[PDB]
Amino acid sequence: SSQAWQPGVAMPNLYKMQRMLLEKCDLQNYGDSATLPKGIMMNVAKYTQLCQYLNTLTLAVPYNMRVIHFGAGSDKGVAPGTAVLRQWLPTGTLLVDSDLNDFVSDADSTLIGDCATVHTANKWDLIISDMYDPKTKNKENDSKEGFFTYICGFIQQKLALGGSVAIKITEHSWNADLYKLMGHFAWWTAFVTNVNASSSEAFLIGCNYLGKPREQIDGYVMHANYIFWRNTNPIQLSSYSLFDMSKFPLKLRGTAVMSLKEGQINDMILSLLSKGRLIIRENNRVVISSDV
């Protein structure tokens, strides 16, 4: 049980290569609960483990990093995920969060309303999404839309080259194009948190956005592959990783930020993006609005 000490489990590349029909998700660990530390919210534990896993990836960490967090408000009126992100990111990184309903946040700026009302004349270095409607499971599991349509547009239009994403999905809350868009990254996976291993929840993690496809992915097939992987590989619930926080904060690598024309981009630049060593965007002032 070596994986019980890890923050979570990532989808093996073997299951990605398959071609499976979609099936209902039936988890052996369903109904089980991870014994969380005394008084620690589930979102705190979940986001902590996600950030722990992200620390093992080749994320670009430029100075004055720009991070945006969607679906950051819980029913309690607070923003547990934003709290972990601010704890995790280097001091001086711009953190902006959003949600449909009002909430209190530790982020620099908070935008309230449907995510489609968020407008920004700026590219971003990291995109985190927890958006999820408990009533999105309405009787054949087909590709969903809504905030996903915005996310795919936001990735393609407002994500700096070399930036990364982490988008929450479930058995029924998923999107085919988002799976396809994971091939536009240098590296991608589906990450399951050990604390929430009993659920079908996972985070689609794209690393080092390249702006063009290096891998052609069928969205519908890939989701079936993910469902097949979860049904065949039970995951033991664990909150053990929450007790090792000494190396938790994100190492600031001072990644270069360069504004570059699309024609200036070549194989040498792409290799830099794939290694988290370069971010391509403007360094102008950040402006973001929420239409009313």
């Binding site: 008084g39 919210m41 607070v78 601010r86 209190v104 946040s105 530790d106 982020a107 000494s246």
Partner: protein
């Protein structure tokens, strides 16, 4: 006055404000009252700043001229014995200006 209002509501036996976001940390920090990172020591708990402010939680204006909250965006360390009401503890206590610790909780000045 919300500050005096909350002190009275507690004295009447009412339940303290809940859903204060407690962070995970090594509990090997400096112990100072308010910090940009969780600095709780073995005797403290670290909470999100925004969730422990009465004026932020109640969506009301703050007791300052420029609408500046010294908690929001930072982390407040609370003694574990007083961890069942982080909002009350911050309202009832002051931070030593020189050493950065709570006056009466870790202040040797």
């Amino acid at each position: 006055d919300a500050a005096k209002a909350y002190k009275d509501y507690l004295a009447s036996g009412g339940q303290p404000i809940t859903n204060c976001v407690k962070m995970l940390c090594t509990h090997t920090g400096t112990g100072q009252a308010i910090t940009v990172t969780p600095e709780a020591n073995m005797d403290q708990e670290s909470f999100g700043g925004a969730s422990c402010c009465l004026y932020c939680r109640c969506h009301i204006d703050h007791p300052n001229p420029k609408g500046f909250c010294d908690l929001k965006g930072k982390y407040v360390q609370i003694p574990t014995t007083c961890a069942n009401d982080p909002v009350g503890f911050t309202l009832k206590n002051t931070v030593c200006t020189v050493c950065g610790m709570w006056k009466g909780y870790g202040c040797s000045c």
